[PDB]
Amino acid sequence: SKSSWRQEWLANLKLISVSLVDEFPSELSDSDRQIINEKMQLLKDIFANNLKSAISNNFRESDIIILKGEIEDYPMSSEIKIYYNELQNKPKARFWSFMKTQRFVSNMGFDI
């Protein structure tokens, strides 16, 4: 069943657009910033070369949005959270933190 769930996800990822945000939700050290940035880049490579997804430069034009934290950690002033808030107050994009994403990609058979 997880095997079937992976094959369904794998086939669907070939027809998905992924966006990786540049905004950090909160204050971190230069070390924590660097570690996240490295993972973001590794994740971008997994989606484009292994999962075969399209990489979108506009998060408003993508199916899955990779964040530098949880959406609840993002400030009200941030464009990514302003966009998120609209999709709640209107009846379809996905918002995954890098940690959530890293685990999903592990579940796809790819470990950073």
Binding site: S1, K2, W5, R6, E8, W9, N12, L15, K92, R94, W96, K100, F104, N107
Partner: peptide, 9 residues
């Protein structure tokens, strides 16, 4: 196209 991101429990 909108199946769960989390594996089945």
């Amino acid at each position: 196209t909108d199946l769960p991101s989390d594996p089945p429990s």
